Amino acid sequence: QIVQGHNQVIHQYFDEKNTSGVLVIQTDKKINLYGNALSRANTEYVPASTFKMLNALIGLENQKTDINEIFKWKDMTLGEAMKLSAVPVYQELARRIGLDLMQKEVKRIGFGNAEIGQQVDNFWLVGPLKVTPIQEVEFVSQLAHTQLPFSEKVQANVKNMLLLEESNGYKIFGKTGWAADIKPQVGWLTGWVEQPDGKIVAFALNMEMRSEMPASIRNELLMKSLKQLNII
């Protein structure tokens, strides 16, 4: 039920960037694999800031913050901080949750290897928490469908923080991640497309990064691939 898709064109997209990558697509029926390094789909990597999705769910569910709270620096909300790079709001939230509640929630959700270690404010960037791209697409598909074991309102509020782009009636939700301080570097873009008729198609892009690459390379590869697959 996890099968290589029609991959002759998308494979070349990753080759052209001179790196190894996979794109996992989950529909209501199938999981398909694309890219030039399909073994990445079942390989565990640190989640990097893709973990912000679960951090926000845990923090909101346990009333450690709310969507209107202003975090002092600009000063900003949890939702404003979701899409921003190198902001400490999510480290502060992790400290409020605390190691014990964070580990209990991550174990209850079963996210990746579900190991957070002893440092509550960085385990998603350097380990020991790791997750495969297949696990990430399954997690984000559950979020999109309001099927995670959290409040419906909490799931809706986190989904609203994840809107990336809208065009031509399609909404693209998701979250970037880049673990730059481990070797090799790991890049993520995990999320879903809400098509005009309401159908949901979830994705997880995972690729090796290098320091000279523009951050936009992940979105660039994602959009070209989703177009080739007629998902947008």
UniProtKB/Swiss-Prot annotation:
MF terms (GO), sorted A to Z: hydrolase activity; penicillin binding
N6-carboxylysine modification, residue list: K52
Catalytic activity: a beta-lactam + H2O = a substituted beta-amino acid
This protein's GO CC annotations: periplasmic space; plasma membrane
Top-level EC class: hydrolase
InterPro entries membership: Bact_Transpept/Beta-Lactamase, Beta-lactam/transpept-like, PCN-bd_Tpept
Regulation: Inhibited by the desmethyl carbapenem, MA-1-206, via a covalent binding to Ser-49.
Main subcellular location of this protein, as a coarse class: periplasm
Enzyme Commission number, as recorded: 3.5.2.6
Localisation: Periplasm
Organism superkingdom: Bacteria
Gene3D superfamilies given in the database record: DD-peptidase/beta-lactamase superfamily (3.40.710.10)
PTM notes: Carboxylated on the epsilon-amino group of a lysine, with the resulting carbamate functional group serving as a general base. Probably N-carboxylated at Lys-52 at neutral pH in vivo and undergoes complete N-decarboxylation, at pH 4.1, in vitro.
Family matches, as PANTHER family: BETA-LACTAMASE YBXI-RELATED, PEPTIDOGLYCAN D,D-TRANSPEPTIDASE
Family membership: Belongs to the class-D beta-lactamase family.
Subunit composition and interactions: Monomer.
Protein name: Beta-lactamase OXA-23
Species, as recorded: Acinetobacter baumannii
Gene name per UniProt: OXA-23
